[PDB]
Amino acid sequence: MTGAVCPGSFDPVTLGHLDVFERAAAQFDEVIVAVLINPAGMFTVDERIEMIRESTADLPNLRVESGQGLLVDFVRERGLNAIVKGLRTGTDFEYELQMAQMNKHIAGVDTFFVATAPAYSFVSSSLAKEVATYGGDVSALLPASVHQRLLGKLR
Amino acid sequence: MTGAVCPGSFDPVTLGHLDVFERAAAQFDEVIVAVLINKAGMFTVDERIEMIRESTADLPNLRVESGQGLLVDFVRERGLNAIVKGLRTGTDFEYELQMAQMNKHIAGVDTFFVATAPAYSFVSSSLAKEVATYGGDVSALLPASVHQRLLGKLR
Amino acid sequence: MTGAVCPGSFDPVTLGHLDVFERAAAQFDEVIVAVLINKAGMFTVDERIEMIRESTADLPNLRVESGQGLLVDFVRERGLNAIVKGLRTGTDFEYELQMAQMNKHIAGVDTFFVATAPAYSFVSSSLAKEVATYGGDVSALLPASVHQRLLGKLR
Amino acid sequence: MTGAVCPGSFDPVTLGHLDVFERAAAQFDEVIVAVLINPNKAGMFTVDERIEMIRESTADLPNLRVESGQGLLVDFVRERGLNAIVKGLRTGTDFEYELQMAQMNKHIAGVDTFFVATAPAYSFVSSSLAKEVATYGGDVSALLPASVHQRLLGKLR
Amino acid sequence: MTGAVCPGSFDPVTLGHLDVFERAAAQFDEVIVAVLINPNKAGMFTVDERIEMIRESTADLPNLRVESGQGLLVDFVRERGLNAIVKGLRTGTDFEYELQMAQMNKHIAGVDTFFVATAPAYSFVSSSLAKEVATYGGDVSALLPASVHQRLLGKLR
Amino acid sequence: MTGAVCPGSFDPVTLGHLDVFERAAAQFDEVIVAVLINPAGMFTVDERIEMIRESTADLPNLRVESGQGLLVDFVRERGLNAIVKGLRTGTDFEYELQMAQMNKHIAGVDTFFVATAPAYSFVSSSLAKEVATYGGDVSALLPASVHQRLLGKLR
Ligand SMILES: Cc1ccc(C(=O)O)c(C(=O)O)n1
Ligand SMILES: Cc1ccc(C(=O)O)c(C(=O)O)n1
Ligand SMILES: Cc1ccc(C(=O)O)c(C(=O)O)n1
Ligand SMILES: Cc1ccc(C(=O)O)c(C(=O)O)n1
Ligand SMILES: Cc1ccc(C(=O)O)c(C(=O)O)n1
Ligand SMILES: Cc1ccc(C(=O)O)c(C(=O)O)n1
Numbered sequence: 032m033t034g035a036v037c038p039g040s041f042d043p044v045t046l047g048h049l050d051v052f053e054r055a056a057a058q059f060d061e062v063i064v065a066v067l068i069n070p071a072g073m074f075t076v077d078e079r080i081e082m083i084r085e086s087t088a089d090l091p092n093l094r095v096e097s098g099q100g101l102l103v104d105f106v107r108e109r110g111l112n113a114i115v116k117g118l119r120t121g122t123d124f125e126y127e128l129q130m131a132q133m134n135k136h137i138a139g140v141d142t143f144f145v146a147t148a149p150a151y152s153f154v155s156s157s158l159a160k161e162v163a164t165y166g167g168d169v170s171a172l173l174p175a176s177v178h179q180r181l182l183g184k185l186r
Numbered sequence: 187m188t189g190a191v192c193p194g195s196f197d198p199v200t201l202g203h204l205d206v207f208e209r210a211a212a213q214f215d216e217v218i219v220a221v222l223i224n225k226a227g228m229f230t231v232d233e234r235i236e237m238i239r240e241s242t243a244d245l246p247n248l249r250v251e252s253g254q255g256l257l258v259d260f261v262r263e264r265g266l267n268a269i270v271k272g273l274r275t276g277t278d279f280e281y282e283l284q285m286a287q288m289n290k291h292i293a294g295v296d297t298f299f300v301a302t303a304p305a306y307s308f309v310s311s312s313l314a315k316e317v318a319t320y321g322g323d324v325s326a327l328l329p330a331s332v333h334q335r336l337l338g339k340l341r
Numbered sequence: 342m343t344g345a346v347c348p349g350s351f352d353p354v355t356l357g358h359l360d361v362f363e364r365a366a367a368q369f370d371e372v373i374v375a376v377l378i379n380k381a382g383m384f385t386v387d388e389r390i391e392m393i394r395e396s397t398a399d400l401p402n403l404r405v406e407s408g409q410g411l412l413v414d415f416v417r418e419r420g421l422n423a424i425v426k427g428l429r430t431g432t433d434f435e436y437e438l439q440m441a442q443m444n445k446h447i448a449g450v451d452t453f454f455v456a457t458a459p460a461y462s463f464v465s466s467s468l469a470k471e472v473a474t475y476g477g478d479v480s481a482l483l484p485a486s487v488h489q490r491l492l493g494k495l496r
Numbered sequence: 497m498t499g500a501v502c503p504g505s506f507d508p509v510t511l512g513h514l515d516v517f518e519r520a521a522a523q524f525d526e527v528i529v530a531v532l533i534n535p536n537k538a539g540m541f542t543v544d545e546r547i548e549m550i551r552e553s554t555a556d557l558p559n560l561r562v563e564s565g566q567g568l569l570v571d572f573v574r575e576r577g578l579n580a581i582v583k584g585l586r587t588g589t590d591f592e593y594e595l596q597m598a599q600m601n602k603h604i605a606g607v608d609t610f611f612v613a614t615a616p617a618y619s620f621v622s623s624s625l626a627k628e629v630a631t632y633g634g635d636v637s638a639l640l641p642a643s644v645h646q647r648l649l650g651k652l653r
Numbered sequence: 654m655t656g657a658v659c660p661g662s663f664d665p666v667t668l669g670h671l672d673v674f675e676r677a678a679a680q681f682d683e684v685i686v687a688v689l690i691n692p693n694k695a696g697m698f699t700v701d702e703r704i705e706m707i708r709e710s711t712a713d714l715p716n717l718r719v720e721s722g723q724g725l726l727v728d729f730v731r732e733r734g735l736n737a738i739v740k741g742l743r744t745g746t747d748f749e750y751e752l753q754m755a756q757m758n759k760h761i762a763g764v765d766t767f768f769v770a771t772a773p774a775y776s777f778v779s780s781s782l783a784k785e786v787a788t789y790g791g792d793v794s795a796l797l798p799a800s801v802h803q804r805l806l807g808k809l810r
Numbered sequence: 811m812t813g814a815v816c817p818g819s820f821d822p823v824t825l826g827h828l829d830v831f832e833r834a835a836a837q838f839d840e841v842i843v844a845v846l847i848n849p850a851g852m853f854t855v856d857e858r859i860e861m862i863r864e865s866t867a868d869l870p871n872l873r874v875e876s877g878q879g880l881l882v883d884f885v886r887e888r889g890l891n892a893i894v895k896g897l898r899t900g901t902d903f904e905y906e907l908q909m910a911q912m913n914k915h916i917a918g919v920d921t922f923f924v925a926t927a928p929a930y931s932f933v934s935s936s937l938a939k940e941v942a943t944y945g946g947d948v949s950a951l952l953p954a955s956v957h958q959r960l961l962g963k964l965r
Contacts, residue, residue, distance in 0.1 A: 033498050033523060033524060033525060035523070054608045057579070057608070058498060058500070058524075058579075058580050058608060058610070059498060059523075060498060100789045100790070101786070101789040101790060101791050103791070104789075104790070112522075113523050115610070118595075119284070120280060120283050120284040120287060121280050121281045121283070121284035122280070124591075125744060125745050125746075126745045128585075128613055128744050128745070128777075129743075129744040129745035129777050129779070129782065130782070131613055132613060132616060132744060132776070132777035133777050133778075133782060133786065135615070136777065136795070136796075137786060137791045137792050137793070138791070141519045141522070141523060141612060142612065142613075143523075143582070143610035143611065143612050144610065144611040144612070145608060145609065145610050145611070146595055146598055146599065146609075148599075148602070149459035149460060149462050149463065149599060150459055150460070152287070152459055152462075153283075153284045153285075153287035153288050153291065153459065154288070155284070158284065158285070158288055162256065162288065162292060165255045165256045165259070166255075166256070166259075167256055167258070167292045167293075168292055169292070171291075172291075188343050188368060188369060188370060190368075209451045212422075212451070213343060213345075213369075213423045213451060213453075214343060214368075215343060267367075268368045270453070273438075274753075275749060275752050275753040275756060276749050276750050276752070276753035277749075279434075283428075283456055286455075286456055287456060287459060290458070296364045296367070296368060296455060297455065297456075298368075298425070298453040298454065298455050299453065299454040299455070300441075300451060300452065300453050300454070301438055301441055301442060301452075303445070304442060304928035304929055304931055304932065305928060305929070307756070307928050307931075308752075308753045308756035308757050308760065308928065309757070310753070313753065313754070313757055317725070317757065317761060320724045320725045320728075321725070321728075322725055322727075322761045322762075323761055324761070326760075327760075410944045410945075411941065411944045411945070411946055413946070414944070414945075429596075430592060430595050430596040430599060431592050431593050431595070431596035432592075435899060435900050435901070436900045438899050438900070438932075439898070439899040439900035439932045439934070439937065440932075440937070442899060442931070442932035443932050443933070443937055443941065446932065446950075446951075447941060447946045447947055447948070448946075462599070463595075463596045463599035463600050463603065464600070465596070468596065468597070468600055472568070472600065472604060475567045475568045475571075476568070476571075477568055477570075477604045477605075478604055479604070481603075482603075586908075587904060587907050587908040587911060588904050588905045588907070588908035589904075616773035616774055616776055616777065617773055617774070619773055619776075619911070620773065620907075620908050620911035620912050620915065621912075622908070625908065625909070625912060629880070629912065629916060632879045632880040632883075633879070633880060633883070634880050634882070634916045634917070635916050636916070638915070639915075655812050655837060655838060655839060657837070676920045679891075679920070680812060680814070680838075680892050680920060680922075681812060681837075682812060736836070736837075737837050739922070742907075748903075752897075752925055755925055756925065756927075756928060759927070765833045765836070765837060765924060766924065766925075767837070767894070767922035767923065767924050768922065768923040768924070769920060769921065769922050769923070770907055770910055770911060770921075772914070773911060
């Protein structure tokens with residue numbers, strides 16, 4: 032039984048995230064999306080989880096959970112030791128590499144990186160929110176349910 | 187009827203910026219420098235605009251305006267669809283690429299990048315202010331007008 | 342009286358190149374595609390030129406010429422002093438920056454960089470030829486005319 | 497029935513490669529090491545030598561096997577009923593080229609590429625730099641598995 | 654009478670920093686570790702604590718001394734009759750910003766900056782990531798000198 | 811007694827190289843420029859050494875020697891264990907980092923990197939030769955004696 036964790040704040044989840052989720056779910060027996068919260072954003076943890084579940088309805092081996100603290104503890108507590116992280120334009124890859132090597136050192140957890148599809152490579156949660164805030168149309172970059180909710184939080 | 191917008195916070199404008207303005211003005215019929223308002227910074231919007239106008243008096247086809255909201259709206263509301271953005275040492279080019287792809291997606295606006303001259307490649311508004319704050323000589327890196335104004339804000 | 346030169350070996354021209362040509366032609370009055378002759382490659386200079394002309398028939402202000410020697414001489418001998426160069430995934434941008442600074446130094450020619458559309462961001466002439474050689478379908482990544490011609494050279 | 501292909505020329509395999517093999521084998525049900533051969537440029541080691549050196553240093557990995565191939569990697573992957581590649585990263589990896597290839601490979605064949613950074617201890621070895629250093633007498637013994645080191649010295653002498 | 658300044662906030666010093674200190678001390682007649690303080694943002698450790706942790710882990714380096722400062726690094730360097738900075742590189746270093754600062758520092762004061770990559774074993778530690786990991790219970794004991802680790806745990810508790 | 815080696819092929823030496831030499835000579839008691847030859851260029855080893863000696867006449871603690879084989883052997887044979895390498899626009903820094911870590915591992919030799927001055931940041935031996943070959947003026951980027959010799963080898 033294989034498995035990996037897909038971590039992020041997902042505030043909100045984007046089609047870039049979904050693409051990575053789909054690829055993880057296709058290649059591992061079990062995937063857990065870890066909605067990591069800070070001491071703070073647009074959507075509550077519960078809202079974020081609901082948006083991810085709506086978007087991943089077709090992935091029966093993927094589940095969504097909230098987490099706090101050390102990512103490697105979240106991973107190991109669930110009997111796993113792999114992380115799958117997406118890459119997009121603007122990803123701080125050098126910092127991701129630093130964290131991957133740190134996470135392997137402190138807990139033996141591996142990190143696999145996968146680039147999101149070119150079509151979704153320039154969306155990020157932060158930039159989608161910024162563009163939407165000023166009336167820009169990011170509907171092609173987000174799940175339909177997310178775009179609906181986003182307009183709600185803004186209007 | 188060609189034209190481009192050169193965006194930035196310009197707090198203050200540097201010779202690195204001016205070099206890019208000059209190239210934009212040499213290659214496009216019309217250039218608009220967009221002083222993006224959203225942090226208070228050191229100089230007020232009017233001061234920034236004044237300093238740019240003073241530094242670009244020899245560029246007849248260049249004008250300076252402030253703007254709020256999406257950069258692409260600023261560009262499109264003036265009948266243009268090109269941005270000219272400078273590169274220097276320390277530019278977050280990956281983030282600029284993300285924004286360029288987003289801006290093309292949401293509004294059909296092209297972004298052209300040009301590297302500033304080597305002599306001005308290590309100045310930024312932030313680093314110039316920091317160095318000058320602590321008594322370093324940045325007079326070779328700023329328009330003569332700007333430099334005096336900066337000393338004024340500090341003393 | 343604005344103008345830019347779009348240089349490359351174009352062996353063959355891709356949709357990534359065409360996207361850049363289209364943007365250059367939309368933002369400058371005059372565009373010259375420079376097919377730089379110096380390795381024999383797959384297609385002859387005349388074939389490359391033909392394929393570009395066929396692919397750019399809807400761009401009235403664009404023309405195609407071959408060139409030898411310094412790119413800056415090609416540009417300056419046509420009364421221009423701007424280069425428009427595309428960026429894709431795998432572009433050696435650091436080398437392009439070195440050449441841009443050198444070209445500005447020796448001839449006062451500016452270089453503007455523009456990222457090609459995400460959909461065409463992973464095609465290159467080399468990778469398209471390699472993949473097609475081994476039977477991969479690159480028809481979505483090349484002008485329809487070019488694609489048939491490529492199949493011809495292979496079969 | 498999960499699985500991935502770990503590709504390379506492995507001329508010779510290094511401890512950097514082996515680290516990546518081990519991680520892939522720990523995270524996928526089956527792993528195939530694809531020894532990709534250019535039929536028009538011989539390397540230092542023959543295909544059989546390359547395969548033997550990998551097998552001898554992966555004997556502890558029961559779910560890993562080693563096969564050679566040529567042409568499109570995605571055909572090698574798909575003909576084995578898989579659609580994942582696991583590729584290692586080290587210092588000096590042309591990551592932008594690997595990203596270009598990954599996006600191309602997804603486009604033409606639907607195959608996903610997962611990248612994993614090799615351990616810091618092995619992050620500066622590559623087949624090419626190991627061969628170069630050894631050619632001029634440098635000690636690369638700590639960077640290559642035992643199945644490789646003296647065979648490499650043999651080729652050079 | 655050669656010499657270099659090794660700058661940082663060292664809040665706390667890591668084994669990555671110490672590796673760089675050791676290399677600088679091996680290659681220059683004198684080394685000064687400059688503990689640069691922002692007078693308007695306190696860190697986890699006080700200046701005296703930072704200096705004590707560095708001193709305790711550099712006792713074997715007779716030609717290294719430790720001093721705090723603020724403001725322009727190049728003034729700290731020049732007022733000591735030196736004109737070289739030795740700065741470490743690790744994974745996640747903002748090298749482009751360091752390059753910008755190096756060119757600025759040469760321009761305004763004639764001071765040269767030499768960069769050296771820390772050892773692979775210490776390449777993924779940083780003061781900030783060590784503090785973050787330790788805050789949430791992760792084991793960073795192998796990445797920090799003995800002068801630091803339990804003091805860090807003390808601050809966090 | 812401190813010391814470092816500055817390695818390269820220097821075919822020919824540029825002002826970028828000279829800037830690095832000067833900084834090494836200012837910071838180390840002894841500097842050795844290692845002219846490394848391959849199994850191949852424009853100038854012979856002896857010509858390269860002569861051009862470097864002409865350019866470094868004012869550096870009494872710097873000497874020039876040819877070398878073959880492992881750079882770390884060259885360094886250690888001379889009682890040293892430091893390398894000083896310059897950085898310019900277009901340097902393959904990731905490969906330099908790989909070699910530095912390899913060189914430290916196999917022989918305990920440290921590598922210090924220093925960026926050349928912005929004015930000399932876009933010259934390289936290869937690009938200077940290429941530009942000069944087609945009649946471009948690189949005289950501001952090379953020592954006077956070198957530029958003289960370069961015109962000689964070309965004409
Ligand atoms: C698909 C994807 C991958 C990575 C990131 C990230 O860098 O945090 C993002 C995002 O910024 O929201 N998105
Ligand atoms: C000439 C120039 C080009 C780009 C930038 C930028 O990254 O915003 C700057 C700056 O930081 O002030 N300056
Ligand atoms: C669209 C595009 C932009 C740039 C390049 C290049 O790096 O030369 C290429 C290509 O490799 O064919 N293509
Ligand atoms: C461990 C490892 C990962 C990737 C590579 C590569 O860039 O091909 C190598 C190598 O070059 O031999 N090695
Ligand atoms: C060894 C080392 C070198 C450089 C840095 C840095 O980027 O400031 C660090 C750190 O962040 O603590 N550490
Ligand atoms: C000053 C300098 C530093 C490094 C290099 C290099 O990368 O080889 C060069 C060059 O290319 O000739 N020049």
